[PDB]
């Protein structure tokens, strides 16, 4: 398991009539546990997160503890092939490329 | 409870020698549940989140379901008063001001 | 001479509450790290803040 870090998650796109390029659609996702003090490889925490962690350590019990989530994304392009028409589409904010707990 | 939104959370800053201004330190927190289809008041979801929600709906079981987290911050200024010295500090990324689940 | 009187006044004005339940936690400020022109503008800022604080 280890600390908050990125990992693979992919699917396959299928159509009954046309053919899609690329086939394997890749969209990563991260998982793990980020604790106090930090033992990670991503940038340093913010002030909000350290405040929440200290509140937790003192003895309180929060209703929404910190979580590992993404903070950056990248776009993608798809091509659909069929007789009498070849089409292309571009969609932004599809692939995760960096993440850290907030 | 309701859906993902912003809520109040504040503390008191105390010092044994100097006096701090302002006293009550305010730092809101994001809390709630975001589902499918969206019934919220924040901006529309991204493509990653809808992909994850559809994966969950089909029958899969993810190891890290989407969570309500903040996405913006603001700085703050503090003043410390004591004999022979009045000091001021500015710290960024302290107060949460928006929510949206990722 | 002058600032100490301001500190005493600020301490005096902060009267304790009379509510029967704790409003929130208290935490010391220790680990969220960052003709004098200082003592000139800082006091202006402090008085501006006290203006809003005292109305409560």
């Amino acid at each position, epitope marked *: 398991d280890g600390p908050c870090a990125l990992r693979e998650l992919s699917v396959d796109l299928r159509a009954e009539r046309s053919v899609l390029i690329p086939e394997t659609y890749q969209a990563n996702n991260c998982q793990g546990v980020c604790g106090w003090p930090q033992s990670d490889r991503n940038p340093r925490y913010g002030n909000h997160v350290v405040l929440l962690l200290k509140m937790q350590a003192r003895g309180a019990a929060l209703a929404r503890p910190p979580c590992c989530v993404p903070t950056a994304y990248a776009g993608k392009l798809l091509i659909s092939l069929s007789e009498e028409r070849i089409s292309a589409h571009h969609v932004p904010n599809m692939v995760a490329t960096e993440c850290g707990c907030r | 409870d309701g859906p993902c939104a912003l809520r109040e959370l504040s503390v008191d800053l105390r010092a044994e020698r100097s006096v701090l201004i302002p006293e009550t330190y305010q730092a809101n927190n994001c809390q709630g549940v975001c589902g499918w289809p969206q019934s919220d008041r924040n901006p529309r979801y991204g493509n990653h989140v809808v992909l994850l929600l559809k994966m969950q709906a089909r029958g899969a079981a993810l190891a890290r379901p989407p969570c309500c987290v903040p996405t913006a911050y603001a700085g703050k200024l503090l003043i410390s008063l004591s004999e022979e010295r009045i000091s001021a500090h500015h710290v960024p990324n302290m107060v949460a001001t928006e929510c949206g689940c990722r | 001479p002058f600032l100490e009187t301001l500190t005493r006044l600020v301490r005096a004005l902060r009267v304790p509450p009379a509510r*029967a339940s704790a409003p929130r936690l208290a935490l010391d400020p220790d680990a969220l790290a960052g003709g004098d022109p200082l003592r000139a503008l800082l006091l202006l800022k402090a008085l501006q803040g006290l203006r809003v604080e005292w109305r409560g």
Partner: antibody
Amino acid sequence: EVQLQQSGAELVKPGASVKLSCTASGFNIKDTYMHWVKQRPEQGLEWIGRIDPANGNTIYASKFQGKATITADTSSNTAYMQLSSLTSGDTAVYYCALFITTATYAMDYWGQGTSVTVSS
Amino acid sequence: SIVMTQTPKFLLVSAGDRVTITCKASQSVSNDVAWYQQKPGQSPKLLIYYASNRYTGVPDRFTGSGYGTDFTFTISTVQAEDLAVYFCQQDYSSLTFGAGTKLELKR
């Protein structure tokens, strides 16, 4: 962690006074108030009073006024309650408590209970 | 002072039923309420604070709701480890601790 420790059971004559104690551990009492609670076998729970160690301002209920004195000492993280003018109706169990409830977080800690008996 | 009335005063379940308890107030108490639990020979322990949140370690069976002047606390599927007495507390003024409700099983 946090732990609240109390004294042992006591038996007193009908007309004397008692002094119960409650000491914290792994915590600083200056952070928040301390409450004292009473319980009778069948009358249910009740509220006696609270103290604020930082300033020394204490609050008592409208029924226990004049026969219960709460004091605190932060040099060793301890609180005392003096109960006076016993009348054989105070035989009960007393608790030391810390309460905080807020829209986003909460904290609730209780003692172990001290039993007080009045008989001749 | 605010007076809190709790019902029912007694109960009896069959280890598979659903349970509901009501705790009405004598005056507008906003949404400051707490639901506790006390087993024999032990000190109470918080279960629900404010009006809907859950303390750490509480399973998903327990839940509560209400606002203004009516508050309710319900358990979905009773088990054999839920024999205790339940109280409702308010905090808008000098604290008051309800009256208490018992519980029993069948066989």
